[PDB]
């Protein structure tokens, strides 16, 4: 429910590992990567001189 920058993501992974365990966390990391790529693309975030 936050704005979920880099640090927040890493601590979310760490909390998942401390609460659930190895396998759920590995599946979690894969899902995070997939969905982050997907919405980075959807965004079309670019960089212009303006």
């Amino acid at each position: 429910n936050q704005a979920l920058g880099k640090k927040a993501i890493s601590k979310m992974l760490n909390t998942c590992y401390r609460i659930l365990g190895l396998k759920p966390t590995v599946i979690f990391a894969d899902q995070i990567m997939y969905t982050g790529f997907a919405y980075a693309a959807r965004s079309g975030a670019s960089v212009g001189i303006d």
Partner: protein, 87 residues
């Protein structure tokens, strides 16, 4: 299928004994020693060994018990065989 050994380690609580045990069982199943205890699923011998370990069907104790049983059947057959070759 296999992606992690976390539960296998949970059984044999070392991750260093686990390798030695799984290698023992897998060399068994690979050279003409034995046949899997979990239904093989087109898995290679090492992954089958791990899948067996997970179910609590293989550990060091199990393997030693099985080995001594094998040696004793070996003794029985071999004594009978020498006796037969006598007469």
């Amino acid at each position: 299928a296999r992606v992690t050994v976390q539960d296998a380690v949970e059984k044999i609580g070392n991750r260093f004994d686990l390798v030695l045990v799984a290698a023992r069982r897998a060399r068994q199943m690979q050279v003409g020693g034995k046949d899997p205890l979990v239904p093989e699923e087109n898995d290679k011998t090492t992954v089958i060994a791990l899948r067996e370990i997970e179910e609590g069907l293989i550990n060091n104790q199990i393997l030693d018990v099985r080995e001594r049983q094998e040696q004793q059947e070996q003794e029985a057959a071999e004594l009978q065989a020498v006796t037969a070759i006598a007469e």
